[PDB]
Design a protein around this ligand. Structure first.
Ligand SMILES: *C/C=C(C)/C=C/C=C(C)/C=C/C1=C(C)CCCC1(C)C
Ligand SMILES: *C/C=C(C)/C=C/C=C(C)/C=C/C1=C(C)CCCC1(C)C
Ligand SMILES: CCCCCCCCCCCCCCCCCCCC
Ligand SMILES: CCCCCCCCCCCCCCCCCCCC
Ligand SMILES: CCCCCCCCCCCCCCCCCCCC
Ligand SMILES: CCCCCCCCCCCCCCCCCCCC
Ligand SMILES: CCCCCCCCCCCCCCCCCCCC
Ligand SMILES: CCCCCCCCCCCCCCCCCCCC
Ligand SMILES: CCCCCCCCCCCCCCCCCCCC
Ligand SMILES: CCCCCCCCCCCCCCCCCCCC
Ligand SMILES: CCCCCCCCCCCCCCCCCCCC
Ligand SMILES: CCCCCCCCCCCCCCCCCCCC
Ligand SMILES: CCCCCCCCCCCCCCCCCCCC
Ligand SMILES: CCCCCCCCCCCCCCCCCCCC
Ligand SMILES: CCCCCCCCCCCCCCCCCCCC
Ligand SMILES: CCCCCCCCO[C@@H]1O[C@H](CO)[C@@H](O)[C@H](O)[C@H]1O
Ligand SMILES: CCCCCCCCO[C@@H]1O[C@H](CO)[C@@H](O)[C@H](O)[C@H]1O
Lengths: 215, 61, 61, 223
């Protein structure tokens, strides 16, 4: 059941949101931004899953269904994840602009590709895939070097979140390729189930790791 | 330590979801429909094993 | 490092084996035969995860 | 193909056997029987797989098929693995006899259960399963204590091999229960593939781990 999986995603995101909200209730000036960001990451994702669970934003596109709020979710929450990582790394405005731009290209491409029939969707996929490699470069290169210049505590938390992020984000394009937007070997239910799992780990799992480290 | 239980339990859950599609397809009596559900299940599980291994590698290392 | 490549690659090999049985069953036309190959494939892949995770736990901890 | 899987098993075991034989060619007095044991473990397994690949020993039981050389392999090689662990742990004859006995009950039980129809096969399964738990207790309890009376290198290697053994062996009875001898949800092919993988890791992987630690053990007492 699609709507059931969507509901489960909503519940998971909600519990995450509340947990993060509660954890940062007494946060100082140096931690507040991080908690607020976590709340936003899981909170927006919660809205998207509820909307999909109510059957809204399901778009028919050439013998496949495209879940619009999923991509809108991605477009809005992933740069917040990058922002969180960027705060740890100690980036400035220019550097932030670079990684958010690359991230935005990834999400827009996947969305545009999902709604385009024929071989063009793979061209759009390619745009996203290349921009993603660019993003990965910054995370494991310059941003890692920038994070290294801070205290070992911050550096360790950065690396831990970086690794979770790079490893698991890299799985998304394979689901896209094998799922409905691509060769359609994965049924919509399997595609949705896998994405619910990944979303929860890359946002909620991400958050609890950060909460543990701040402790 | 606790990641393994989590990973193991989610896998049997996803397995149950996969088996659900397969039997639903089987109730149609259409062999090709079952094949479609089956390859989805197979590829889904390969990917799932990737997520779990990736989650293990990111959390325990 | 080396183990995750080994474990990953073996997962695709067993996947190919599972897919082979599924398509062999689908070539009979019998939907029940396909379901039979599919549950074997699903359960097999779950056991494979246990082996992989077991191997990882044994040689990297 | 079943025979293809059996050939893969045979080739894997053979490679392991030769590597273990080669590695031990210069072994001192104190190391020699460890290499010889490894050669025996993978060598017997190699024979069992070649025999099965040649289509010999495929025993029709009701409508399932039981691969006799597999269980014979098990009955003969698993106590050699236990023996290897026992040498590391430094067991005496009494302690060896206990663990070899338990191991044998496990393998006899599984073979007999595979040959029997109906409720009885689970009774035979239960015998092996309980025996296996007893064996695990010895491996992780008394034998671990025994290994702690030796050098840190030896205890280290013992723990590594013990953990590999306990974790992976515990997977075998689930394959039995879900496969042909049990409720038969795994096809023969899938059953065989999983066991080939397990057999290779528990013998050949087991061996290469021991091989990788040899130099450390040698440097530990002056060499
Ligand atoms: C919480 C939701 C998250 C972390 C979603 C992450 C999604 C991606 C990393 C998607 C990447 C894609 C490519 C790299 C290629 C084009 C297809 C995309 C958009 C799926
Ligand atoms: C190299 C081949 C090896 C290490 C085979 C090991 C086989 C076992 C540990 C089998 C255990 C079983 C039980 C514990 C229950 C009854 C079914 C058995 C015999 C499969
Ligand atoms: C139809 C729109 C439904 C909106 C669903 C909202 C789901 C909850 C997400 C926010 C949770 C509250 C966060 C409070 C933080 C303070
Ligand atoms: C359609 C264009 C999509 C944008 C792709 C961006 C990929 C560029 C790769 C970034 C590599 C940056 C290396 C450092 C440069 C300073
Ligand atoms: C100096 C660090 C260089 C790391 C480059 C990593 C490139 C990965 C791109 C994908
Ligand atoms: C150890 C980190 C593993 C991920 C490395 C980052 C590289 C991810 C590559 C993703 C490529 C997606 C495009 C696939 C095209 C087929
Ligand atoms: C983690 C992604 C795994 C992708 C498996 C690819 C299978 C290819 C089959 C076509
Ligand atoms: C690693 C062992 C895996 C056992 C899976 C058992 C699933 C039982 C479902 C019937
Ligand atoms: C089957 C090949 C046997 C070669 C002799 C092995 C001798 C082991 C001692 C080293
Ligand atoms: C294959 C022939 C045997 C290899 C040479 C062994 C030489 C060392 C024997 C001690
Ligand atoms: C001819 C049937 C028996 C052949 C066994 C030989 C296997 C050698 C592996 C060592
Ligand atoms: C061929 C079937 C033999 C069954 C033996 C049952 C008796 C218990 C032996 C262990
Ligand atoms: C059913 C026939 C008897 C089977 C023998 C099984 C042996 C089990 C022994 C109990 C396991 C713990 C051994 C003693 C630990 C102290
Ligand atoms: C000294 C530690 C003893 C641990 C015993 C564990 C028994 C496991 C049985 C399975
Ligand atoms: C102190 C360590 C005890 C935990 C390891 C031993 C118990 C788990 C492995 C043995 C039991 C596995 C299940 C076998 C089913 C028959
Ligand atoms: C749950 C999320 C908690 C992660 C917050 C980690 C931030 C701790 O890092 C802090 O950053 C502050 C902001 O500039 C600075 O005052 C200090 O460099 C540092 O103490
Ligand atoms: C194949 C890997 C080789 C492992 C060799 C481990 C043996 C190291 O230890 C050996 O134990 C012997 C008792 O068995 C004693 O003779 C000596 O203490 C020592 O040589």
């Amino acid at each position: 059941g699609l709507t059931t999986l969507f509901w489960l995603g909503a519940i998971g995101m909600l519990v995450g949101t509340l947990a993060f909200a509660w954890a940062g209730r007494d946060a100082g000036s140096g931690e507040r931004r991080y908690y607020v960001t976590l709340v936003g990451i899981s909170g927006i994702a919660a809205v998207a899953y509820v909307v999909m669970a109510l059957g809204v934003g399901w778009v028919p596109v050439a013998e496949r269904t495209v879940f619009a709020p999923r991509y809108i979710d991605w477009i809005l929450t992933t740069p917040l994840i990058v922002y969180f990582l960027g705060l740890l790394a100690g980036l400035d405005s220019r550097e932030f602009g670079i990684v958010i731009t690359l991230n935005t290209v990834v999400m827009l491409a996947g969305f545009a590709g999902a709604m385009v029939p024929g071989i063009e969707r793979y061209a759009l996929f390619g745009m996203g895939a290349v921009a993603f490699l660019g993003l990965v470069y910054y995370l494991v290169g310059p941003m890692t070097e920038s994070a290294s210049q801070r205290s070992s505590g911050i550096k360790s938390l950065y690396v831990r979140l970086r690794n979770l992020t790079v490893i698991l984000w890299a799985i998304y394009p394979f689901i896209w390729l094998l799922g409905p937007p691509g060769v359609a070997l994965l049924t919509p239910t399997v595609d949705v189930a896998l994405i619910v799992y990944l979303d929860l780990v890359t946002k909620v799992g991400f958050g609890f790791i950060a909460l543990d480290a701040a402790a | 330590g606790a990641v393994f239980i989590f990973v193991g339990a989610l896998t049997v859950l996803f397995g149950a979801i996969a088996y659900g599609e397969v039997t639903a397809a089987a109730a149609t009596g259409d062999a090709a429909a079952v094949q479609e559900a089956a390859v989805s299940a197979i590829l889904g599980l390969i990917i799932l094993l990737g997520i779990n291994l990736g989650l293990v590698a990111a959390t325990l290392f």
